[PDB]
Design a protein around this ligand. Structure first.
Ligand SMILES: *[C@@](C)(CO)[C@](*)(O)[C@H](CC(C)C)NC(=O)[C@H](Cc1ccccc1)NC(=O)[C@H](CC(C)C)NC(=O)[C@H](CCc1ccccc1)NC(=O)CN1CCOCC1
Ligand SMILES: *[C@@](C)(CO)[C@](*)(O)[C@H](CC(C)C)NC(=O)[C@H](Cc1ccccc1)NC(=O)[C@H](CC(C)C)NC(=O)[C@H](CCc1ccccc1)NC(=O)CN1CCOCC1
Ligand SMILES: *[C@@](C)(CO)[C@](*)(O)[C@H](CC(C)C)NC(=O)[C@H](Cc1ccccc1)NC(=O)[C@H](CC(C)C)NC(=O)[C@H](CCc1ccccc1)NC(=O)CN1CCOCC1
Ligand SMILES: [Cl-]
Ligand SMILES: [Cl-]
Ligand SMILES: [Mg+2]
Ligand SMILES: [Mg+2]
Ligand SMILES: [Mg+2]
Lengths: 220, 204, 233, 196, 195, 222, 222, 196, 195
């Protein structure tokens, strides 16, 4: 009965020796209808801050671009880049005012500052705000957790970490019906975030299958 | 809790010049969870091909049921059942469960061995026959398949050309449906040879 | 949130070469009870517009008062109130369309379907529909309620597209409207035989016809119909 | 529906409108709601068209079988068969039926059978949605032992008012006259009865 | 009843099944064996509605054991799985269906191949290299997609299985009190006592 | 659906559109809604597509056995009675809305049956989603003493009204004429006013466009 | 209970070229199974070389277009007649839609035009304001039919180079205005065949640096 | 309730039964449903007793204040005040009111105001649950420019039938005569009107 | 949010609070500290509806810290608990109430006595020797009824607490990922790092 609005993206971000990896898929769905495969689920708030999007597309897209405006106003007023904690808490305090109204958001505020170092904050629409090293959020979060947790170590290299993030999204993209399209990679260091490309699952799956020898469930 | 969209899947059938094609995806899931990528939805009894979408337990049950019935048919009739006759058998059997139906969307495809005429047909869950010259579609991406077939299809396609059309119709329809895809199979059917091709498609 | 109490049924209308015709029966139904029989559901605004209203009559009477007040308000500090700055059909419609949508947005709708028929200052025919949801549309023929289902098919046989409008005379157009009103009397359970009809022509102006009746009806064949199947007597 | 049956000096007359509705759409404007269950035992049907037809078909069957074994059935007997069906299947039926018949011994008789399946023998009976609007009129204007022409006028005027006020009633006014003389069908068109 | 897993490797099928039985806010038992031996080379694990699970499993066990005595022959895993599926396929349109999901791990002695069948309460059968029922699959499938290879040994399969249980113990909300692991191969069925 | 029936001088004509829907989607653009119960008793069907086909075939089958049993040509009232009693028994759950027409030794007949089992008699009838569009035309143009050619024209015009104005109906017009003393003529696709225009472009793909993983010859023989 | 929403059907389609962009939409307006109008335009020139359509519930669609047109007007007043760029218009529309997050406009919005480099641009919105630039987008009742065809023909999805063993993809290239209109016309004729709420007429609005041109084509009226 | 107002040669007469019910219990058998909002502007009350009283009290207040500033109000004006209350508070009101008054210029006038809050000026008006049973009777028997005695008989016979058939109507038949002569109250008891 | 316990002994109050944060079928975090320091000698643990818990705890923390600065004085645990109760007592009749249950463990420096207050989301305050919120109480209360003595030391209290956690880990359906234990005494608040 009610209208179907865009929902989605599966996102992960984990902390490690060389900073923070952030990986997301690009699929938006309206029920079983695949609405888009080219959604930007990462918001580039500033050269040192990222925000991941999961749940309601509009809710996430609207309030995280709004969050970016509030972070800009902070550095104008305070002559200093906003802390990840403060940035996340602006968003968490905002959604808490709308608690019960029906906002649907699962976000992760990832970034680096001098005082904090690399920091990840999980923030969702029912007001939960958690600092942590590893988080997977979205409809395919469990599939991402399965691969990520079983292969995660703090002492991963930048190259291996980037791949594990990419591989974890791919795993979820494969199994979760409401995840897919393409993988967007980011690497956050002391110098800021670095974009590591858009990776279409259409080519990436077969490339990973052949090279890695995994995905033996699938007809080669 | 909608039986026809728990497992997911699609089937499409087309006619060509002295040939028919029937194709299906390979996904079997439980709502969002993809479970199997080897679940074929096309079966055949002699030269008559049957594709079935919908609730997977009923897909399996009906295959077993029609194998049962076509085997007894052949023993008593001393000949293979024809597509026109089989179509009627499917309709009878589905309507027998009118008020407790199999949650399926079957599709018959084949060439009549006597006349040589290409034949396709579709059904709703309670057995209503939908005959067509051009194409039949079924499954969770039926809307998508209708749009693809209606634009891509032209009459009297050669087997080699028909393969490209039906494959492109299935693939691009499946890629716009969450519960369909995970592989695909295409049957090209000529008068006395049948080629089966597995398509390469995106696995998300 | 409303429920309509006293209701008016179909309003039908169409364009012709020089203007527009609109019609609506004189009934105020109270559910199945045909309670009020002297109800005028076509309301002229000036000498160039007629608003036909179906649905809730209490809300219709409110809309009457708004239109009446609109004419008064337009005349204020307006030397050209009966000339260049007179109320156009397009002005009157847009006002109602604004109100209807504002009211639906407040979840307190005017439970009506409205058809504003008229002729603009430049001679152009105006015919546009609006309802309780604020939904608007225009067409060579427009009808509400049962009229939409039964009248439109008959009227579209006369004017099927834009190019058929110049080819349709006022005689041919009125004949189709009167016929449509008969068909509605045959088949609409909340309709009456008595109705009003209005013609707005760019040349002859506004002609308002009251107390019309459906006539030339076919009922004779009924005598031959016996039982519901087998019965011969 | 608007239906009625009226006993008079020479027998009984059944009367009905001809409107069948689906919501506000008139599915049939020339319906025949007066139906034969036996030579001189008829009924007026109100409520569900499907139910009343199914019932009337069964009653006709029962009375035909009764006639083959025991000769002509009484009007009371016919009403009892209607009752038995309506009462025992009250949960699944929407049927307001008036049974009217002419015996030579008992003359004109009218039995009305409302939704519950109860039986009520009356001098005259009214039923259907449009009957509500003519309780006052019919009670004031009914007299026993009327003539044929008086009863026809009484039914015509009554159903005219029922039709005028009830949206669920309309079309033609059908009537069926049941006397010793035989069976006579009458019809009256809008142009006549509307301007009464 | 909650977690049941299955992994088919080169020469065996390995079934893992949680030990917890929970009713309300109490873990009534932490050593429950959620499986029955249908035949010497066929094992069935089960999970679902309380009561239905064991009642169904034993009913199937009785039928397969009856067949074995009658014919003096062991039914193939494929044959047993088809029988089980048909029973569930009947059940789903009954007055009160069996709400039971099963995994059937067996070793076909004629083909000399291990076979794993996943059947849900609707009667939806699939042969798989690895399978799971319930919420378990939402973690284990993607994990196995990555780490599973078709030519693995039984020992490699058990390590692969340990990797699944660890992930479940980390991310699952409920305490399922570990798992009982059983192996099905050419030599029959045996239980891993230390897991 | 839109379906109609019109009586004329020496018989009866029925007609129907050829659209079959599945929600808002047109499933069949040219389906046959005119059904043969017996050689000279035909049936136009609206509503649940499987039900109209199933109920018409079942009664048609029993009518044939009855015709052979009695050594008589079947009557329309027999089909009417058998259909209504069947439908009534199922309390409307069999969603078949039928216009039954034909000729028999008694004469020419026209009836309609609704899902709940109520029957109606008439000279002109219309059922289905586009019955109001059709009935509007019938009420405007019908008269007593129609000829064969006039009744076909009126019937097809009533179907066209449904085709154009009702979204539930479309495509073509099927007609069946049942005249007394003659064979019934079934006019499949009597009108085809909805021909698809030439496409702007051919979408014939270059051979090899589709990526393939495996090929294999399928064995259909024994 | 009063229901403030309704479904007026129809479908819309936006394609972007190299130096142009088209926004097409059928002219049919419906409620339930009735046709309200065969020609009711829902693709509008909003000024500053921006065309817009908000398909779904027409009352909400009209309200939105009306408000955006007004937003363009006040943008000129408040910022010295500055041209509203397509990207700026998109963001503004997001705020219009999200402004009613808890009582939404039941519409799928698409806008088209040229970006600030002169290249073709299409933006699409969900009912509550989430938006995204794309080369291609279908919206409305028949979106599910048309969209996969566009993936195949505009973005060459699932098409590989013949003989390359499905290894080399068909290379992406811009389409000519002639080739795009061919795809639009075929998309709508196909959608008209299989969707009951689509038909009557097709109105295309093409946007180049020179301005906003219009083209109209007949569609099947059944 | 059964209520009606009838215009005639010398002015207008209001009529009503006296029954007030709570379900099937008669809470008051001698109710006065004819109430004064001004010297020669009265109303008949049907629907909720609480709502109609609250409304009539407010209207009386408005017309009293109108009279202090602008002199005697018209019957149309009184009806408009009733309408304004009934229409604007349609969601919270159950009130079917008939407004009847006597001007010297306009003579007898009757305005009826149903649930919606619409206004209908009529020669005569009927309302209340029991009015349904006398639409047929009143339509057939009403004539314009009747005498006082004829109008009293018309109202008495009409409400007698309404009371006879409607369980929600009964008790005494109250009437109020509005003419140039003044205001006259009439009452009629069961023993008289029942046997009409 | 699920398990929060509290035990008042001779010279201290000990609060234990589960570490798990679970949403759906995923344990998002296993190291969550479900407490806030209201003042140097007053600690509040909390559990309940997601978001509400932390929002409420920090709001109370801000108010008590504001009071401390204004008066240059620490409020007594009894005073803090009464303030907290009144805030919850207001909340329950609001448009959207705080669905938060708290334990307030404090050491009164004027009385030289430890104090444990249990307050539910309705604003139902009780001073107790030992307390718990949620399903925890259904096991721990009866256990403490048996093993608790009023003159116990802090070390005896921790062993008594270990006995509660073990019982919960054995019989609770959900994995709550252990507990963070904190002690409140005359020297303030400190955390037990190895539990
Ligand atoms: C007057 C009209 C009122 O009493 C008369 O009594 C006549 C009697 C004559 C016709 C025998 N009654 C009707 O016309 C009768 C009115 C009615 C309606 C519903 C229930 C009971 C009585 N009309 C019908 O029976 C129509 C006849 C068909 C259209 C030819 N049938 C329906 O309306 C069917 C019947 C459903 C039904 C309900 C309960 C018991 C038995 C049958 N209803 C529909 O098809 C529903 N329709 C679906 C689409 O949306 C509108 C409603
Ligand atoms: C006009 C066109 C519309 O009324 C005509 O009346 C035609 C009649 C002709 C075709 C005989 N009506 C239909 O085409 C009819 C409309 C309809 C639909 C649904 C219920 C009642 C009436 N269409 C159908 O009957 C289609 C036939 C298809 C094209 C083969 N059938 C369906 O849509 C089935 C309905 C099955 C059904 C079950 C129980 C009660 C009634 C009907 N629906 C589906 O198949 C949808 N669904 C898809 C996934 O698989 C499960 C079912
Ligand atoms: C005839 C009777 C109906 O048309 C008249 O219209 C009169 C009007 C006169 C009195 C001016 N109407 C009534 O007598 C009226 C009937 C009625 C009932 C409910 C809603 C509308 C009309 N009766 C009343 O208003 C009584 C008068 C009391 C006993 C003095 N009030 C009730 O029956 C109250 C009404 C509450 C109410 C409901 C909806 C809207 C407004 C008010 N109801 C009860 O007390 C419920 N009762 C509790 C005991 O169990 C039985 C039900
Ligand atoms: Cl009937
Ligand atoms: Cl009172
Ligand atoms: Mg996927
Ligand atoms: Mg149409
Ligand atoms: Mg009484």
């Amino acid at each position: 009965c009610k209208i179907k609005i865009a929902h989605g993206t599966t996102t992960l971000a984990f902390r490690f020796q060389g900073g923070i990896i952030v990986a997301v898929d690009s699929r938006a769905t309206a029920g079983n209808w695949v609405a888009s495969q080219t959604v930007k689920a990462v918001i580039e708030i500033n050269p040192f801050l990222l925000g991941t999007m999961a749940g309601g597309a509009a809710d996430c897209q609207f309030w995280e671009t709004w969050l970016g405006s509030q972070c800009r106003l902070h550095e104008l007023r305070e002559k200093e880049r906003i802390s990840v904690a403060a940035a996340s808490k602006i968003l968490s305090n905002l959604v808490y005012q709308y608690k019960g109204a029906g906002l649907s958001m699962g976000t992760m505020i990832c970034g680096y500052t001098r005082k904090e170092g690399p920091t990840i904050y999980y923030v969702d629409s029912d007001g939960t705000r958690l600092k942590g090293d590893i988080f997977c959020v979205g409809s395919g979060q469990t599939f991402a957790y399965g691969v990520l947790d079983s292969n995660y170590k703090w002492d991963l290299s930048v190259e291996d970490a980037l791949y594990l993030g990419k591989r974890s999204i791919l795993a979820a993209a494969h199994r979760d019906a409401y995840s897919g399209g393409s993988v967007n990679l980011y690497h956050v260091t002391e110098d800021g975030w670095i974009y590591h490309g858009n990776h279409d699952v259409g080519e990436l799956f077969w490339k990973v299958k052949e090279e890695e020898g995994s995905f033996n469930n699938v007809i080669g | 809790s909608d039986p026809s969209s728990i497992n997911g899947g699609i089937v499409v059938a087309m006619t060509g010049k002295d040939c028919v094609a029937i194709a299906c995806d390979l996904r079997l899931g439980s709502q969002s969870l993809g479970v199997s990528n080897k679940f074929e939805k096309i079966f055949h009894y002699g030269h008559v091909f049957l594709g079935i979408t919908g609730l997977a337990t009923d897909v399996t049950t009906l295959n077993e049921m029609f194998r049962y019935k076509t085997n007894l048919y052949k023993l008593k009739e001393e000949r293979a059942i024809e597509p026109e006759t089989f179509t009627q058998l499917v309709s009878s059997s589905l309507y027998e469960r009118r008020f407790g139906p199999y949650f399926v969307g079957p599709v018959v495809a084949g060439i009549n061995s006597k006349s040589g005429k290409p034949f396709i047909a579709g059904f709703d869950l309670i057995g209503c026959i939908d005959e067509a010259k051009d194409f039949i579609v079924s499954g969770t991406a039926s809307d998508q398949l209708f749009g693809m077939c209606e634009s891509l299809y032209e009459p009297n396609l050669e087997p080699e050309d028909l393969f490209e059309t039906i494959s492109q119709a299935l693939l691009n329809a499946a890629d716009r449906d969450a519960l369909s895809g995970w592989g695909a199979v295409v049957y090209i059917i000529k008068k006395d040879e049948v080629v089966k091709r597995y398509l390469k498609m995106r696995q998300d | 949130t409303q429920q309509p109490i006293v209701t008016g049924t179909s309003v039908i209308s169409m364009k012709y070469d020089n203007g527009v015709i609109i019609a609506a029966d004189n009934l105020g139904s109270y559910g199945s009870l045909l309670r009020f029989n002297g109800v005028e559901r076509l309301i002229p605004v000036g000498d160039n517009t007629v608003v036909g209203i179906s649905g809730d009559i209490s809300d219709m009477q409110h809309i009457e008062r708004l239109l009446k007040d609109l004419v008064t308000e337009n005349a204020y500090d307006n030397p050209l109130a009966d000339a260049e700055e007179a109320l156009e059909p397009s002005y009157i419609f847009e006002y109602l369309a604004t109100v209807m949508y504002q009211r639906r947005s407040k979840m307190n709708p005017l439970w009506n379907a409205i058809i504003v028929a008229g002729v603009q200052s430049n001679g152009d025919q105006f015919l546009r529909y609006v309802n309780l949801l604020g939904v608007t549309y225009s067409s060579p023929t427009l009808a509400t309620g049962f009229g939409a289902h039964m009248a439109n098919p008959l009227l579209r046989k006369v004017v099927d597209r834009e190019s058929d409008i110049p080819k349709t005379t006022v005689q041919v157009a009125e004949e189709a409207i009167v016929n449509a009103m008969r068909v509605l009397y045959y088949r609409d359970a909340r309709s009456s035989r008595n109705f009003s009809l209005a013609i707005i022509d760019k040349n002859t102006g506004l002609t308002f016809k009251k107390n019309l009746q459906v006539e030339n009806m076919k009922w004779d064949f009924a005598k031959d119909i016996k039982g519901y199947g087998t019965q011969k007597i | 529906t608007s239906i009625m049956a009226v006993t008079f000096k020479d027998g009984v007359i059944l009367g009905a409108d001809s409107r069948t509705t689906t919501g506000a759409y008139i599915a049939n404007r020339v319906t025949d709601k007066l139906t034969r269950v036996h030579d001189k035992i008829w009924c007026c049907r109100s409520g569900s068209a499907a139910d009343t037809q199914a019932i009337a078909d069964i009653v006709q069957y029962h009375l035909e079988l009764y006639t083959s074994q025991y000769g002509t059935p009484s009007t009371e007997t016919a009403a009892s068969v209607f009752k038995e069906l309506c009462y025992e299947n009250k949960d699944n039926l929407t049927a307001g039926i008036i049974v009217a018949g002419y015996d030579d011994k008992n003359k004109g008789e009218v039995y009305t059978i409302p939704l519950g399946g109860s039986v009520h023998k009356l001098p005259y009976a009214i039923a259907g949605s449009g009957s509500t609007f003519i309780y006052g009129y019919c009670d004031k204007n009914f007299r026993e032992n009327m003539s044929k022409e008086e009863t026809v006028d009484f039914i015509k005027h009554s159903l005219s008012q029922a039709i005028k006020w009830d949206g669920s009633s309309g079309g033609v006014i059908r009537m069926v006259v049941l006397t010793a003389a035989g069976v006579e069908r009458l019809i009256f068109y809008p142009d006549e009865y509307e301007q009464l | 009843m909650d977690i049941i897993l299955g992994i088919r490797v080169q020469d065996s099928v390995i079934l893992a099944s949680s030990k917890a039985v929970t009713r309300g806010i109490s873990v009534l038992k932490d050593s429950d064996d959620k499986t029955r031996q249908l035949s010497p080379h066929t094992l069935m694990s089960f999970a679902g509605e309380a009561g239905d699970t064991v009642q169904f499993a034993e009913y199937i066990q009785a039928n397969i054991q009856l067949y074995s005595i009658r014919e003096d022959y062991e039914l193939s895993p494929q044959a047993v799985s088809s029988f089980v599926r048909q029973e569930l396929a009947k059940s789903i349109r009954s007055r009160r269906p069996y709400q039971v999901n099963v995994l059937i791990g067996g070793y076909d002695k004629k083909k000399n191949k291990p076979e794993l069948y996943q059947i849900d309460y609707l009667g939806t059968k699939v042969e798989l290299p690895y399978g799971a029922h319930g919420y378990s699959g939402f973690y284990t499938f993607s994990l196995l997609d990555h780490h599973y290879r078709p030519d693995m040994t039984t020992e490699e399969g058990l390590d692969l299985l340990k990797l699944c249980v660890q992930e479940l113990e980390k991310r699952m909300p409920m305490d399922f009190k570990g798992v009982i692991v059983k192996i099905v191969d050419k030599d029959g069925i045996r239980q891993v006592d230390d897991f | 659906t839109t379906i109609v029936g019109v009586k004329f001088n020496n018989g009866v004509v029925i007609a129907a559109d050829t659209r079959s829907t599945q929600g808002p989607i047109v499933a069949d653009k040219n389906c046959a809604k005119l059904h043969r119960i017996s050689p000279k008793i035909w049936c136009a069907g609206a509503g649940t597509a499987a039900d109209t086909e199933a109920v018409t075939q079942l009664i048609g089958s029993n009518i044939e056995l009855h015709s052979l049993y009695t050594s008589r040509e079947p009557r329309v009232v027999s089909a009417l009675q058998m259909l209504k009693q069947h439908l009534f028994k199922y309390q409307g759950h069999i969603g078949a809305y039928l216009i039954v027409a034909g000729v028999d030794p008694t004469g020419s007949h026209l009836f309609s049956i609704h899902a709940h089992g109520s029957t109606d008699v008439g000279y002109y009838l219309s059922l289905g989603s586009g019955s109001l569009a059709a009935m509007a035309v019938l009420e405007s143009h019908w008269k007593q003493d129609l000829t064969k050619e006039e009744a076909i024209k009126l019937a097809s015009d009533a179907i066209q009204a449904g085709i154009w104005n009702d979204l539930g109906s479309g495509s073509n017009v099927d007609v069946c004429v049942m005249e007394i003393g003659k064979d019934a003529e079934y006019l499949r696709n009597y009108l085809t006013p909805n021909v698809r225009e030439e496409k702007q472009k051919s979408y014939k793909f270059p051979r090899g466009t589709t990526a393939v993983l495996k090929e294999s010859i399928v064995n259909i023989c024994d | 209970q009063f229901n403030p929403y309704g479904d007026n059907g129809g479908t819309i389609l936006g394609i972007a070229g190299e130096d142009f962009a088209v926004l097409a939409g059928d002219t049919r307006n419906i409620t339930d199974y009735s046709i309200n109008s065969r020609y009711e335009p829902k693709v509008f020139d909003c000024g500053d070389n921006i065309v817009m359509s908000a398909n779904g519930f027409a009352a909400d669609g009209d309200a939105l277009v009306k408000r955006f047109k007004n937003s363009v007007k006040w943008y000129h007043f408040d910022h010295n007649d500055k041209k509203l760029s397509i990207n700026s218009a998109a963001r503004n529309i997001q705020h219009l839609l999200y402004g009613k997050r808890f009582f939404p406009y039941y519409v799928h919005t698409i806008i088209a035009g040229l970006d600030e480099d002169g290249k073709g641009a299409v933006y699409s919105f969900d009912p509550v304001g989430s938006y995204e630039r794309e080369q291609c987008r279908a919206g409305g009742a028949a979106a599910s039919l048309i969209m996969p065809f566009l993936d195949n023909q505009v973005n060459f999805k699932n098409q590989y180079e013949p003989g390359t063993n499905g290894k080399v993809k068909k290379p992406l290239k811009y389409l000519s205005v002639e080739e795009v209109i061919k795809l639009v016309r075929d998309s709508f004729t196909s959608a008209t065949e299989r969707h009951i709420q689509v038909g009557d007429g097709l109105e295309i609005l093409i946007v180049t640096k020179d301005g906003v041109r219009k083209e109209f084509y007949e569609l099947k009226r059944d």
